[PDB]
Design an enzyme around this catalytic site. Structure first.
Site, PDB file in Angstrom:
ATOM      1  N   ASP A  42       0.824  -1.205   0.000  1.00  0.00           N
ATOM      2  CA  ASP A  42       0.000   0.000   0.000  1.00  0.00           C
ATOM      3  C   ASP A  42       0.859   1.256   0.000  1.00  0.00           C
ATOM      4  OD1 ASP A  42      -2.254   1.529  -0.116  1.00  0.00           O
ATOM      5  OD2 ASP A  42      -2.866   1.207   1.968  1.00  0.00           O
ATOM      6  N   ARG A  52      -0.162   9.071   1.400  1.00  0.00           N
ATOM      7  CA  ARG A  52      -0.925   9.033   2.644  1.00  0.00           C
ATOM      8  C   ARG A  52      -0.296   8.075   3.657  1.00  0.00           C
ATOM      9  NH1 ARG A  52      -3.848   6.287  -1.322  1.00  0.00           N
ATOM     10  NH2 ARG A  52      -3.922   4.032  -0.911  1.00  0.00           N
ATOM     11  N   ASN A  53       0.548   7.169   3.173  1.00  0.00           N
ATOM     12  CA  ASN A  53       1.188   6.189   4.042  1.00  0.00           C
ATOM     13  C   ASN A  53       2.675   6.451   4.238  1.00  0.00           C
ATOM     14  OD1 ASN A  53      -1.217   4.798   4.457  1.00  0.00           O
ATOM     15  ND2 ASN A  53      -0.922   3.549   2.614  1.00  0.00           N
ATOM     16  N   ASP A  71       5.201   1.105   8.065  1.00  0.00           N
ATOM     17  CA  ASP A  71       5.504  -0.305   7.850  1.00  0.00           C
ATOM     18  C   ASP A  71       4.678  -1.230   8.745  1.00  0.00           C
ATOM     19  OD1 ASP A  71       6.699   0.606  10.149  1.00  0.00           O
ATOM     20  OD2 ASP A  71       8.751   0.120   9.546  1.00  0.00           O
TER      21      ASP A  71
END
Ligand SMILES: *N1=[C]C2=C([C]=[C]1)[C]=C(O[C])C(C1=[C][N]C3=C1[C]=C(C1=[C]C(C(=O)N([C])[C]C#[C])=[C]N=[C]1)[C]=N3)=[C]2
Length: 269
Positions: free
Chosen positions: A132, A136-137, A150
């Site tokens: 993903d 945003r991550n 992670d």
């Protein structure tokens, strides 16, 4: 494991982060150190307990300057905690959208891409996949320090393929074609997602494939439609995007190759 274990009363919860975007993540205080930390908790139906506990176990093995560092866990008795370092400026997407572009300029963008690709080169070597990758991550700290979240890592050996569970829903505009069509994920699908992440960085957080219907994304991709070069985006950065978006997963560059290219561009700037 026991080396990471700590009592819940060593932590005080201050503010709920999110808002709700990442689930039950809280700003917390590691009292003895006066240290602001991020605390993940498990509610009623957030996620299954054994999954939550496996997340904590995997992170114990992860050590890299651009991956969110585990600090401790509370896994003896519920409520279960996962304690990690706190990144003061939040997620990279909102950071890019709201930043001073004169400060966060072209060289800073290269620096960001270099950091992220460095983390992915590490995961690539350690036989992990992210699945993903997106702005945003990614998380931002002082002085444009970028770290990749992670918490959803999966073990997968080089050359092997992870097959997502039936009925799984994906972030379509970040998702590799082989994943969209056959639920197959590999380090090469992370490479594809990194290409989209690059586009997010180059556009300072614009939404990918603007206006394009989600139902036709895969169909466009198989006819070799790709996002055009954003303005201000260096041609060599864009060529790296296009390389990430090759149809055949094996034609896509490794993260080791990607990181080297960015390190060169960043140092020669
Ligand atoms: N388990 C643990 C997690 C996550 C999922 C599952 C997701 C996370 O964020 C991606 C984290 C996390 C670790 N460190 C961290 C995390 C999230 C933030 C953050 C902060 C803010 C913010 O500054 N706000 C809301 C204002 C204040 C105060 C916004 N977004 C994200 C920072 N550090 C752990």
């Amino acid at each position: 494991y026991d080396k990471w274990e700590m009592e819940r009363t060593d932590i005080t919860m201050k503010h709920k982060l999110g808002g709700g975007q990442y689930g039950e993540v809280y700003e917390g205080v590691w009292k003895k150190y006066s240290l602001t930390v991020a605390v993940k908790t498990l509610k009623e139906d957030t996620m299954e307990v054994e999954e939550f506990l496996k997340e904590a176990a995997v992170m114990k093995e992860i050590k890299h300057p651009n991956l969110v560092q585990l600090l401790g866990v509370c896994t003896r008795e519920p409520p279960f905690y996962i304690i990690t370092e706190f990144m003061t400026y939040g997620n990279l997407l909102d950071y890019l959208r709201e930043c001073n572009r004169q400060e966060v300029n072209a060289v800073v963008l290269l620096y960001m891409a270099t950091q992220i690709s460095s983390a992915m080169e590490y995961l690539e070597k350690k036989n992990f996949i992210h699945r993903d990758l997106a702005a945003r991550n990614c998380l931002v700290g002082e002085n444009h320090l970028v770290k990749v979240a992670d918490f959803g890592l999966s073990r997968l050996m080089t050359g092997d393929t992870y097959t997502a569970h039936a009925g799984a829903k994906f972030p379509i505009k970040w998702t590799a074609p082989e994943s969209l069509a056959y639920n197959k994920f590999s380090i090469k699908s992370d490479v594809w997602a990194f290409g989209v992440l690059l586009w997010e960085i180059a556009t300072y957080g614009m939404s990918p494939y603007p206006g394009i219907d989600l139902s036709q994304v895969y169909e466009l991709l198989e006819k070799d439609y790709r996002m055009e070069r954003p303005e201000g985006c260096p041609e060599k950065v864009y060529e790296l995007m296009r390389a990430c978006w090759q149809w055949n997963p094996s034609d896509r560059p490794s993260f080791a190759e990607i990181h080297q290219a960015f390190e060169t561009m960043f140092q020669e700037s």
